[PDB]
Design a protein around this ligand. Structure first.
Ligand SMILES: COc1cccc(OC)c1-c1cc(C(=O)N[C@]2(C(=O)O)[C@@H]3C[C@H]4C[C@H](C[C@@H]2C4)C3)nn1-c1ccnc2cc(Cl)ccc12
Length: 448
């Protein structure tokens, strides 16, 4: 139908530009990045080799299928008819062999790190990626002789029996065999790394390579499995003609698998980067929360430089600033604020860093917070404000600073207690006297 033609055409154009940009940016990045780790540079060479095959499908295969299949009712020549299937077949091999070769290098590095250290270099990996690309072209040569131009339409130039044989072998050799090998090696590599880790940043690269691979495998398996199942349906089909429902099913499934093929190649960079960056982000986030609390000045400085989230909140809603303000680390509080730390950050109860700074009696930090635009009158779910906690725990110095920055003396909590009530009940006579004076500010100012 026309609705289906418009739907699919839009998806192809979306996949094309996003895939071309994504894989295009990837190649530029990985080509022009200087990784300070031998193993991680080799992982990049494989992702660069995958980005190349991803781009060839999107620039040479997608437009032909878009044009000479769905969009319009053949005009790419015999070279194009043969070239299309050859190039598409070649890329799928190059992908499957890149994923296997990568999974092999990771497996050896984890299970045999001693041998892998001496018997693996960037030059050796560059040698195999060539071999992968050269072997891919070698295995894809049969497709040049199975499809040809006749009448002008691009149709098979061999009997269905012979065509069934090459397609069957292709699906097994190009997908089923390698993907399973990659999957097993990846699964085993991940398990033995856990044991290997338990016993400078080689483990991070090995952890990154496993995550990257795992996601890249799942993406291409999920996306090409329907496409290859379809090709096995072709070779193992029953008699001519079936129920209209069955014809509708195979037609939709054919049209679907066609589209799903280009999904994998398009959003692969985004998917493996997202997954890898999520773990690295979460890691650096939790490292910052502990470094900020423990009082590690150097650790916090490095982690913020490495691009850790300064405003990251924990399960209880605490940011690095909350704990740094609580534990009384003035050096870190300033460093955090300089890096754009949210000074009015809330938690589960709705406490700000100023609530915690006042409670623990950190005068110097209380000022630096306020100086950087901290809410002096900020209240929690109970209705407690910094002035309540400062007066409560007998911190006269802070009470003066808070009042000096316009702290509400009449502010009450759920229990109907003012900062004065807390000061009096806690036997803080010194604080309570200043609070009663502050309350009579309006009276004295005008009259006197
Ligand atoms: C008997 O084949 C199937 C049975 C059930 C479901 C099917 O597709 C989901 C298929 C199927 C697969 C292919 C299938 O994979 N074409 C090719 C491809 O690359 O896609 C074409 C055509 C040949 C040479 C070459 C490589 C193969 C096989 C290009 N084509 N194809 C179909 C063949 C015949 N009639 C069909 C009718 C319907 Cl409604 C749907 C699919 C049909």
């Amino acid at each position: 139908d026309i609705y289906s033609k418009v739907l699919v055409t839009a998806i192809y154009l979306a996949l094309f530009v996003v895939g071309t940009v994504g894989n295009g940016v990837t190649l530029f990045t990985l080509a022009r990045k200087k990784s300070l780790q031998s193993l991680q540079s080799r992982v990049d060479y494989y992702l660069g080799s995958l980005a190349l095959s991803d781009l060839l499908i999107l620039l040479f295969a997608l437009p032909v299928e878009l044009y000479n299949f769905i969009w319009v009712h053949w005009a790419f020549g015999d070279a194009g008819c043969k070239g299309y299937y050859f190039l598409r077949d070649a890329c799928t091999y190059a992908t499957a062999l890149n994923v296997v070769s990568l999974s092999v290098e990771l497996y050896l590095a984890i299970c045999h790190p001693f041998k892998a250290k001496t018997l693996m270099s960037r030059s050796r990996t560059k040698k195999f990626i060539s071999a992968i690309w050269l072997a891919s072209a070698l295995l894809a040569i049969p497709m040049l002789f199975t499809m040809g131009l006749q009448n002008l339409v691009c149709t098979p130039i061999v009997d269905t029996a012979t065509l069934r044989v090459v397609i069957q072998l292709n699906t097994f050799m190009s997908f089923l065999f390698p993907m399973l090998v990659a999957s097993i090696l990846n699964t085993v590599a991940a398990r033995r790394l856990t044991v290997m880790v338990h016993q400078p940043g080689r483990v991070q690269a090995l952890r990154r390579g496993v995550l990257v691979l795992r996601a890249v495998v799942i993406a291409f398996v999920v996306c090409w499995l329907p496409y290859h199942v379809r090709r096995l349906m072709f070779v193992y089909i029953s008699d001519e003609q079936w129920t209209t429902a069955l014809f509708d099913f195979y037609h939709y499934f054919y049209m679907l698998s066609n589209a799903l093929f280009y999904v994998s190649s398009a959003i692969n960079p985004i998917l493996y980067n997202l997954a890898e960056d999520l773990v690295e982000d979460w890691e650096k986030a939790r490292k910052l929360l502990e470094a900020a609390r423990k009082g590690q000045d150097d650790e916090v400085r490095i982690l913020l430089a490495n691009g850790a989230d300064v405003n990251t909140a924990d399960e209880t809603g605490f940011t690095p600033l909350h704990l740094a303000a609580w534990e009384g680390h003035l050096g870190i509080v300033e460093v955090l604020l300089k890096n754009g730390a949210d000074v009015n950050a809330n938690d589960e109860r709705g406490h700000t860093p100023l609530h915690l700074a006042a409670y623990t009696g950190h005068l110097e930090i209380v000022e630096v917070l306020l100086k950087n635009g901290a809410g002096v009158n900020a209240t929690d779910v109970i209705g407690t404000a910094p002035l309540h906690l400062a007066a409560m725990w007998g911190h006269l110095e802070i009470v003066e600073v808070l009042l000096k920055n316009g702290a509400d003396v009449n502010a009450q909590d759920k229990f109907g207690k003012t900062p004065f009530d807390l000061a009096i009940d806690n036997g803080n006579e010194d604080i309570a006297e200043v609070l009663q004076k502050a309350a009579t500010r309006e009276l004295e100012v005008l009259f006197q």
